[PDB]
Design a protein around this ligand. Structure first.
Ligand code: D74
Length: 330
């Protein structure tokens, strides 16, 4: 089997991407944030504290003939940006772009943090990291991909995120028309439950490539590119007027600037992030100070190849017995 679904930026900055997902019988379609940095599929629901729902579409398990309460199961998750959610668990039929999994764990939110409430466009998350990170207790549950894998034509999914435009998540096949040149594959460590890999280095604009190992995760659920302070300093030094602002919470730059590209290494291959991908607009409405899309990972504990990097590439998440990651230009 295969699946193919369009993923769409939630706003003009590509802050996140939503993908429609069919849950239950008859189908209830929710727009979920596909997140290769986590492993829970959770949704706003009829069980979510009423005051914490503000415009989201909710899953109502009582209206699904295939929904079953997973007795005694609870979940609770906190993300890297400080947001969180928790609740109980159902199993139900879940379909993405024509690909169907029966008995998928659908984690129903009873509580969500303010940042989820305030984002009316995201109805929940669909985790695509390794199932070892799944927070369901006392019986850990499998991701949608993990459940689908055996049935897929090939045990892979691909992320093809657009810049200010729709893109595609495919399951079970590689669309050879969706990228240019070749796909370069690179080793993955699953020890932390992430799609963790090692970039071979970087370049700023037309500058010389610096060969240096940068360990990080491929994370579709993170907006920006988070890299070591040395690398980030080298980038923003090429932008006149750019500076790190503790009050704003990262590097900012004059909105009148022209940003240089940023290149990262995948083996001997190179992925080029165009300068305008790194522009996240005024820090507040009407400001002439703009927020940078490349930021220091120093306070995180890990480097993150988030959407700013991934949307510059066609990315293969290869879930073979020994997982690997593939990157192509597009
Ligand atoms: C501080 C700031 C200013 C302008 C824009 C942002 C973006 C960057 C990324 O973290 C996303 O979640 C934010 N909406 C952040």
């Amino acid at each position: 089997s295969t699946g193919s679904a369009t993923t769409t930026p939630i706003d003009s900055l590509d802050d996140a991407y939503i993908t429609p997902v069919q849950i239950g019988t008859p189908a209830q379609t929710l727009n979920l944030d596909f997140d290769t940095g986590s492993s829970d599929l959770w949704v706003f629901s009829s069980e979510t504290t009423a005051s914490e729902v503000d415009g989201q579409t909710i899953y109502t398990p009582s209206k699904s003939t295939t929904a079953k309460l997973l007795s005694g199961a609870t979940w609770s998750i906190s993300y890297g940006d400080g947001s969180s959610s928790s609740g109980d668990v159902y199993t139900d039929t879940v379909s993405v772009g024509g690909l169907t999994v029966t008995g998928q764990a659908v984690e129903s939110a009873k509580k969500v943090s303010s940042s989820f409430t305030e984002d009316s466009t995201i109805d929940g998350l669909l985790g695509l990291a390794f199932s070892t990170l799944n927070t369901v207790s006392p019986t850990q549950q499998k991701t949608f991909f993990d459940n689908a894998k055996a049935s897929l034509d090939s045990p892979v999914f691909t992320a093809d995120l657009g810049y200010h435009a729709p893109g595609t998540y495919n399951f079970g096949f590689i669309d050879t028309t969706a990228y240019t040149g070749s796909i370069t594959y690179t080793a993955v460590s699953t020890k932390q439950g992430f799609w963790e890999w090692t970039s071979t280095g970087y370049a700023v604009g037309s500058g010389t490539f610096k060969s240096t190992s940068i360990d990080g995760i491929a994370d579709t659920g993170t907006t920006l590119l988070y890299l070591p302070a040395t690398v980030v300093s080298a980038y923003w030094a090429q932008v006149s007027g750019a500076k790190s602002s503790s009050s704003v919470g990262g590097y900012v730059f004059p909105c009148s600037a022209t940003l240089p590209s940023f290149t990262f290494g995948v083996g001997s291959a190179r992925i080029v992030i165009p300068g305008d991908y790194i522009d996240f607009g005024p820090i507040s409405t009407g400001s002439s100070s703009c927020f940078g899309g490349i930021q220091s990972s120093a306070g995180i504990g890990i480097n993150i190849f988030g959407d700013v990097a991934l949307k510059a590439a066609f990315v293969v998440f290869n879930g073979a017995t020994t997982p690997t990651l593939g990157f192509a230009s597009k």
